[PDB]
Design an enzyme around this catalytic site. Sequence first.
Site, PDB file in Angstrom:
ATOM      1  CE  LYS A 116      -4.413  10.119   5.610  1.00  0.00           C
ATOM      2  NZ  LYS A 116      -4.185   8.716   6.086  1.00  0.00           N
ATOM      3  CE1 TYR A 117       1.860  13.020   6.459  1.00  0.00           C
ATOM      4  CE2 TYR A 117       0.396  11.272   7.199  1.00  0.00           C
ATOM      5  CZ  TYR A 117       0.688  12.616   7.070  1.00  0.00           C
ATOM      6  OH  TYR A 117      -0.191  13.560   7.548  1.00  0.00           O
TER       7      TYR A 117
ATOM      8  CG  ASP B  37      -4.206   7.376  12.408  1.00  0.00           C
ATOM      9  OD1 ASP B  37      -5.397   7.685  12.194  1.00  0.00           O
ATOM     10  OD2 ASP B  37      -3.413   6.999  11.505  1.00  0.00           O
TER      11      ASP B  37
ATOM     12  CE  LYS C  86       5.634   3.818   8.673  1.00  0.00           C
ATOM     13  NZ  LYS C  86       4.466   4.208   9.543  1.00  0.00           N
TER      14      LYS C  86
ATOM     15  N   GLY D 102       0.808  -1.203   0.000  1.00  0.00           N
ATOM     16  CA  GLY D 102       0.000   0.000   0.000  1.00  0.00           C
ATOM     17  C   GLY D 102       0.842   1.254   0.000  1.00  0.00           C
ATOM     18  NE  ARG D 103       2.383   5.472  -3.948  1.00  0.00           N
ATOM     19  CZ  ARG D 103       2.257   5.375  -5.262  1.00  0.00           C
ATOM     20  NH1 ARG D 103       1.226   5.946  -5.852  1.00  0.00           N
ATOM     21  NH2 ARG D 103       3.157   4.709  -5.968  1.00  0.00           N
TER      22      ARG D 103
END
EC number: 2.7.11.1
Length: 327
Positions: free
Chosen positions: A47-48, A154, A66, A44-45
């Site tokens: 926001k950061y 979060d 990551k 996945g990608r």
Amino acid sequence: GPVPSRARVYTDVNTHRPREYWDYESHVVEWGNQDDYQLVRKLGRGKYSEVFEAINITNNEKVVVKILKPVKKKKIKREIKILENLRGGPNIITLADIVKDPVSRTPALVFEHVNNTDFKQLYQTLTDYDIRFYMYEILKALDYAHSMGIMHRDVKPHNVMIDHEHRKLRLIDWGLAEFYHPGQEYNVRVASRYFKGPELLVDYQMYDYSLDMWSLGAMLASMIFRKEPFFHGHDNYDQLVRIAKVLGTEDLYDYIDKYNIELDPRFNDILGRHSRKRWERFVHSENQHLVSPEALDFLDKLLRYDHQSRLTAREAMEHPYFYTVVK
């Protein structure tokens, strides 16, 4: 102006630390060897960053890499320092390494691998017992972080990795986490819409660990009521209205009045007048097996407008909802 607020637990913990603990800007990153890792699949990608499944070719261990992106560069060292501060704590994802990616030329954080099942599919299969069990496991991670002077900010299903085969849970993605300092004003643009606490939605900046306890409650409500998400706003304004249609407007006004907060005037024409609803309103034949008086009482004590009134993580762990969970 707004009335100030402080956490009712772990209030002063950072003040007693060496500056280095919390002064993440001064941290010197320790670098491993990027050639130890071979990327296998992009997962996945965010926001950061881009997240990959990878293999540590040295020990054959599956890992997660990551590769950090961001434009708020300060977040790099903040996340790294928080991860190092929390490493080894209960149910905290382990940062295994930090390497420089030769293509991005940015840091790549290497984490332990957890064999997760997509929450949308997984949550449809959790029994009552399992919800209690995994909620208790999340609480261990939250109380540890809070006791260490850190708020996650979060908490949401996407950030809770569960290897259900082995009944193993990890709280991940500490990239929005912060150190709690009494009296500090924080950015309210944190958390995902459906999990944002009322303090964020009313623009109250002097919040604390209790933000995470709201988010946990919003997760719990979705799980026990089989309603995803529980508070389903179209935008951050409607999000508050959706909350008020459950918790009521009078208690919302009492909350903002206590803190001498004024709602964005754009609420004048959308908020309306809503009674507090009894939780039984949300119970039906399809979710009844997940609902009990203890679940409803626990939920009721997490989903409070006033952040100071919510259960702490340790108080939550004392709740009767968990008496049936083997420890």
